[PDB]
């Protein structure tokens, strides 16, 4: 019972940048393309019926040469790091995976750029562990 969160669907809260569709290979209607600024984020919300460990999978494209690593923070601060190396092209997508603890109830998940390049393009977030559904943005 994984939860797959796409742009333009319940549980997708914000991108500092735009939702774009001009590179092939994404899923849903697009992908998030952040501003080129550190701290630029993609934000989702997840409701968990019980606290407990989840595995998050972030599908992403990085057509630049440099890593564009992310800070992943839950409820404005768990604080995690996500490594986001080059995928070799803006049309090649890979996944980065990270285990986190979610609390029972609402979990605002922010993935933010650690560098001035912003994040790679972010296609989707997948969440596995217990019962999780779209949360409340805000
Ligand atoms: Ca997508
Ligand atoms: Na960008």
From TrEMBL:
Coiled coil: none annotated. Disulfide bonds join 13-137. It is found in: Secreted. Residues 4-128 form the CBM6 domain. Alpha-D-glucuronate binds at residues 33, 68, 121. Ca(2+) 1 binds at residues 6-7, 27, 30, 123. Ca(2+) 2 binds at residues 33-34, 36. Belongs to the faeC family. Involved in degradation of plant cell walls. Hydrolyzes the feruloyl-arabinose ester bond in arabinoxylans, and the feruloyl-galactose ester bond in pectin. Active against paranitrophenyl-acetate, methyl ferulate and wheat arabinoxylan. This is Esterase D. The gene is xynD.
């Amino acid at each position: 019972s994984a939860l797959l969160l796409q742009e333009a669907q319940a549980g997708f809260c914000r991108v500092d940048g735009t939702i774009d569709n001009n590179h092939t290979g994404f899923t849903g209607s697009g992908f998030a393309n952040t501003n080129n600024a550190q701290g630029a984020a993609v934000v989702w919300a997840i409701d968990a019926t019980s606290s407990g460990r989840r595995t998050l999978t972030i599908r992403y494209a990085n057509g630049g040469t440099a890593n564009r690593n992310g800070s992943l923070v839950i409820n404005g601060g768990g604080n995690y790091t996500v490594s986001l190396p080059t995928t070799g092209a803006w049309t090649t997508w890979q996944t980065a995976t990270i285990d986190v603890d979610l609390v029972q109830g609402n979990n605002i998940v922010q993935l933010s750029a650690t560098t001035a390049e912003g994040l790679p393009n972010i296609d989707s977030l997948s969440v596995v562990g217990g019962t999780v559904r779209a949360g409340n943005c805000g």
